[PDB]
Design a binder for this molecule. Structure first.
Ligand SMILES: [Mg+2]
Length: 268
């Protein structure tokens, strides 16, 4: 029946320490050794997902990474890029100028580094810590980044960040996707890009149907993929409308809710 499991990271696969428990790690290696393919799907840049993919040995079992909210899909065994999307270059100065005017930091990603004009902003430091990426600070953001980029982030207290969200939603005329993940992280990613849409592109490419997929997540950004999957699973710490949309509600991330769901579905 089921052939593929898609997992969100923060609040889902990882615990409150942002680590993968021994139980989740061992159940996920087992189910892959048994032939089930794993997908990690996250807003994180690819570099922030890689250590986890390697810990789960996905490079050995044909796993996929869906990074940047679905903007990139990579086969982690072959390292072949299946789906790639970037922001229109011409929108980047508008993002920069809005951040500047609202005195908030903007960042983007350039290989192994986060690039920003303020490496001392605690929210920039938060994103770097989470993704284990060095920060390269610049005084000329637009000159010092390598374009095109898969995504930018504007960061700051929600009270200051929400009006930036509102202003860019209006000004950008739908040209890119604008939304907050954490309350202090404003995601700026290509138009249309979300986890379910990108999952659907993966399935079409590998010849699978959505009835063959389990998706597990917690946040409103996972709602669409939990509905799309044949078996949508909400974490016990999920948003209430996410729980209501799911086919199954599991335990919290800290309670190994991923392993508890997988073990009820498969015989490991
Ligand atoms: Mg999450």
């Amino acid at each position: 029946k089921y052939k593929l499991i898609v997992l969100d990271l923060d609040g889902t696969l990882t615990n409150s320490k942002k680590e993968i428990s021994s139980r989740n790690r061992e159940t996920l290696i087992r189910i892959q050794e048994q032939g089930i393919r794993l997908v990690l799907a996250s807003g994180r840049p690819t570099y922030g997902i890689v250590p986890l993919a390697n810990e789960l040995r996905m490079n050995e079992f044909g796993g996929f990474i869906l990074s940047y909210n679905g903007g990139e899909i990579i086969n982690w065994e072959s390292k072949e890029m299946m789906y790639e999307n970037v922001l229109p270059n011409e929108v980047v100065p508008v993002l920069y100028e809005c951040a500047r005017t609202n005195h908030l930091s903007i960042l983007t990603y350039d290989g192994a580094e986060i690039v920003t004009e303020n490496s001392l902003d605690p929210y920039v430091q938060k994103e770097a810590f989470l993704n284990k990426m060095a920060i390269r600070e610049t005084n000329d953001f637009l000159t010092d980044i390598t374009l095109p980029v898969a995504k930018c982030l504007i960061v700051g207290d929600a009270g200051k960040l929400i009006p930036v969200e509102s202003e860019l939603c209006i000004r950008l005329q739908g040209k890119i996707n604008v939304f907050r993940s954490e309350p202090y992280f404003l995601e700026l990613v290509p138009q249309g890009i979300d986890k379910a849409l990108s999952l659907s592109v993966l399935l079409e490419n590998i010849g699978m149907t959505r009835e063959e997929v389990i998706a597990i997540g917690d946040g409103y950004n996972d709602l669409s993929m939990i509905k799309f999957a044949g078996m949508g699973v909400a974490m016990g710490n999920a948003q209430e409308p996410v729980k209501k949309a799911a086919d199954y509600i599991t335990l919290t991330n800290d309670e190994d809710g991923v392993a508890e769901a997988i073990e009820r579905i498969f015989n490991v």
